[PDB]
Enzyme design. Structure first.
Site, PDB file in Angstrom:
ATOM      1  N   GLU A  35       0.829  -1.195   0.000  1.00  0.00           N
ATOM      2  CA  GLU A  35       0.000   0.000   0.000  1.00  0.00           C
ATOM      3  C   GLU A  35       0.868   1.251   0.000  1.00  0.00           C
ATOM      4  O   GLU A  35       2.009   1.240   0.481  1.00  0.00           O
ATOM      5  CB  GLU A  35      -0.925  -0.034   1.205  1.00  0.00           C
ATOM      6  CG  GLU A  35      -1.822   1.170   1.393  1.00  0.00           C
ATOM      7  CD  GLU A  35      -2.883   1.206   0.342  1.00  0.00           C
ATOM      8  OE1 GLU A  35      -2.518   1.474  -0.822  1.00  0.00           O
ATOM      9  OE2 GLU A  35      -4.040   0.816   0.625  1.00  0.00           O
ATOM     10  N   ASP A  66      -2.078  -5.150   1.411  1.00  0.00           N
ATOM     11  CA  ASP A  66      -1.407  -3.990   1.997  1.00  0.00           C
ATOM     12  C   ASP A  66       0.044  -4.295   2.354  1.00  0.00           C
ATOM     13  O   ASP A  66       0.900  -3.421   2.210  1.00  0.00           O
ATOM     14  CB  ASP A  66      -2.105  -3.464   3.269  1.00  0.00           C
ATOM     15  CG  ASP A  66      -3.496  -2.883   2.992  1.00  0.00           C
ATOM     16  OD1 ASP A  66      -3.603  -1.761   2.476  1.00  0.00           O
ATOM     17  OD2 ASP A  66      -4.481  -3.473   3.482  1.00  0.00           O
ATOM     18  N   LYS A 115     -14.409  -7.463   4.801  1.00  0.00           N
ATOM     19  CA  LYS A 115     -13.154  -7.639   4.070  1.00  0.00           C
ATOM     20  C   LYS A 115     -12.995  -9.073   3.577  1.00  0.00           C
ATOM     21  O   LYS A 115     -12.510  -9.313   2.462  1.00  0.00           O
ATOM     22  CB  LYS A 115     -11.949  -7.274   4.957  1.00  0.00           C
ATOM     23  CG  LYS A 115     -11.960  -5.880   5.542  1.00  0.00           C
ATOM     24  CD  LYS A 115     -11.786  -4.775   4.520  1.00  0.00           C
ATOM     25  CE  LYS A 115     -10.392  -4.192   4.560  1.00  0.00           C
ATOM     26  NZ  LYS A 115     -10.174  -3.304   3.387  1.00  0.00           N
TER      27      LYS A 115
HETATM   28  O1  LIG Z   1      -7.044   0.972  -2.018  1.00  0.00           O
HETATM   29  C1  LIG Z   1      -6.825   0.237  -1.013  1.00  0.00           C
HETATM   30  O2  LIG Z   1      -5.908  -0.643  -1.049  1.00  0.00           O
HETATM   31  C2  LIG Z   1      -7.710   0.405   0.219  1.00  0.00           C
HETATM   32  N1  LIG Z   1      -8.742   1.470   0.175  1.00  0.00           N
HETATM   33  C3  LIG Z   1      -9.634   1.653   1.354  1.00  0.00           C
HETATM   34  C4  LIG Z   1     -10.733   2.713   1.452  1.00  0.00           C
HETATM   35  C5  LIG Z   1     -11.928   2.560   0.743  1.00  0.00           C
HETATM   36  C6  LIG Z   1     -12.928   3.526   0.875  1.00  0.00           C
HETATM   37  C7  LIG Z   1     -12.719   4.627   1.703  1.00  0.00           C
HETATM   38  C8  LIG Z   1     -13.812   5.674   1.882  1.00  0.00           C
HETATM   39  N2  LIG Z   1     -14.009   6.400   3.034  1.00  0.00           N
HETATM   40  N3  LIG Z   1     -15.079   7.184   2.818  1.00  0.00           N
HETATM   41  N4  LIG Z   1     -15.549   6.953   1.608  1.00  0.00           N
HETATM   42  N5  LIG Z   1     -14.792   6.015   0.995  1.00  0.00           N
HETATM   43  C9  LIG Z   1     -11.534   4.763   2.423  1.00  0.00           C
HETATM   44  C10 LIG Z   1     -10.533   3.807   2.316  1.00  0.00           C
HETATM   45  C11 LIG Z   1      -9.224   4.024   3.118  1.00  0.00           C
HETATM   46  F1  LIG Z   1      -9.111   3.242   4.241  1.00  0.00           F
HETATM   47  F2  LIG Z   1      -8.174   3.801   2.267  1.00  0.00           F
HETATM   48  F3  LIG Z   1      -9.158   5.317   3.563  1.00  0.00           F
HETATM   49  C12 LIG Z   1      -9.466   0.768   2.588  1.00  0.00           C
HETATM   50  C13 LIG Z   1      -8.425  -0.279   2.637  1.00  0.00           C
HETATM   51  O3  LIG Z   1      -8.309  -0.953   3.611  1.00  0.00           O
HETATM   52  C14 LIG Z   1      -7.544  -0.463   1.464  1.00  0.00           C
HETATM   53  O4  LIG Z   1      -6.586  -1.469   1.532  1.00  0.00           O
HETATM   54 MN   LIG Z   2      -6.326  -2.049   3.752  1.00  0.00          MN
HETATM   55 MN   LIG Z   3      -4.676  -1.390   0.440  1.00  0.00          MN
END
Ligand SMILES: O=C(O)c1[nH]c(-c2ccc(-c3nnn[nH]3)cc2C(F)(F)F)cc(=O)c1O
Ligand SMILES: [Mn+2]
Ligand SMILES: [Mn+2]
Length: 177
Positions: free
Chosen positions: A62, A90, A116
């Site tokens: 990540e 990640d 998840k």
């Molecule tokens: O792209 C990744 O790899 C990734 N993306 C997320 C993620 C998804 C949606 C929102 C959101 N919050 N409010 N609206 N949408 C925030 C996130 C954040 F945690 F990155 F901030 C979570 C993961 O755990 C991950 O691994």
């Molecule tokens: Mn994550």
């Molecule tokens: Mn991630």
């Protein structure tokens, strides 16, 4: 808003730039989607802390550009034989030889763990979920890290939540997950 100010005062410049980069990629403005911005910074910080608690035990996936993230994953898959995940995880654990998906939730750790797992369905990628309440949930209750390292992560997350509270930003944040 206060949220950008908080983000730039409690997160390290590198994390902030990375989070803004992610958002500029999707097409999102950190000055409008302020709670998302904070969540990206918080999850990035947790990932980096997790990795830093590791001779390097964890490879950080990540926070890298997709091209480079998938280069790292591909190299790991070809040298270990470990199957290729469908979604970019990640971290990678070289000691336990498994990818790790880190979750940070404002809700109950079990709701987000179920979310998840249902999302990845790759029985190989380990899951570790942290809350802002000092709670954690992990595949097979294998928490991977030692108590002090997990405690440091929990303390930091609780501290972010309380900084947001002092600034009247927590309620918006926890309802924005
Ligand atoms: O792209 C990744 O790899 C990734 N993306 C997320 C993620 C998804 C949606 C929102 C959101 N919050 N409010 N609206 N949408 C925030 C996130 C954040 F945690 F990155 F901030 C979570 C993961 O755990 C991950 O691994
Ligand atoms: Mn994550
Ligand atoms: Mn991630």
């Amino acid at each position: 808003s206060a949220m950008e100010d908080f983000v730039r005062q409690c997160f390290n410049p590198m994390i902030v730039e990375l989070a803004e980069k992610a958002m500029k990629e999707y097409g999102e403005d950190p000055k409008i989607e302020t709670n998302k911005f904070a969540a990206t910074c918080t999850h990035l910080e947790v990932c980096f802390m997790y990795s830093d608690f590791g001779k390097h035990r964890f490879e950080i996936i990540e926070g890298r550009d997709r091209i480079m993230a998938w280069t790292v994953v591909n190299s790991i898959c070809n040298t270990t034989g470990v199957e290729k995940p469908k979604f970019l995880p990640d971290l990678y654990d070289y000691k336990e030889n498994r990818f790790i998906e880190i979750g940070v939730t404002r809700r109950e750790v079990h709701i987000y763990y179920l979310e998840k797992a249902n999302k990845i369905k790759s029985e190989k990628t380990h899951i570790h979920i942290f809350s802002f309440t000092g709670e954690e949930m992990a595949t097979k209750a294998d928490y991977t890290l030692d108590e002090e390292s997990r405690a440091r992560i929990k303390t930091r997350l609780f501290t972010i939540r309380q900084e947001m509270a002092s600034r009247s930003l927590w309620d918006s944040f926890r309802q924005s997950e």
